[PDB]
Design a protein around this ligand. Structure first.
Ligand SMILES: [Cl-]
Lengths: 77, 75, 63
């Protein structure tokens, strides 16, 4: 009968909508995870950069000292 | 046949709830995305500053090397 | 009918978010390369500074 077919069809449409929403949800969650990993990696990079800043500071101090010494040695000559 | 209407109302209500949750999670995702963006720009600034600083440091080191060579030539 | 449309809308917005995230991770990779290069240059400058200290010590020994 056409009635049962129409009923089944309506149910199928409902199922399509629900599935579509599920598809969006899951993809969104994938984006969430990837975002999280990206954040972690970026933070590691932050740490690395900060350490590099420390080392660079030390090297700059050393270079200043060397500049003073060279300055004096040039004063001598 | 009011039951037929009731069932439809139930289905639509459930679908509506799903849509809501989807919207909320999407909004949160957008917020976190904003966060990540700001953190990214900040990190870029840090990288640029670091590069500039060590460029200056490189030039200073080179100048030091030159002065050293010049002083060593006097001996 | 506000379900089949609000679904397409959220889908489009989601796609935009995905593209955004892609651009973001690209930028992140670029940052990775930057970090590597920075490390190389840093080590190089460290060795240079060491050498400078040695030569300075030499010049000081000459006096
Ligand atoms: Cl450095």
């Amino acid at each position: 009968d056409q009635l049962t077919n129409d009923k089944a069809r309506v149910e199928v449409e409902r199922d399509n909508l629900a599935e579509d929403i599920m598809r969006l949800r899951e993809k969104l969650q994938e984006e969430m995870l990837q975002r999280e990993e990206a954040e972690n990696t970026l933070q590691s990079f932050r740490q690395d950069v900060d350490n590099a800043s420390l080392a660079r500071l030390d090297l700059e101090r050393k270079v200043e000292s060397l500049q003073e010494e060279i300055a004096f040695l040039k004063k001598l000559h």
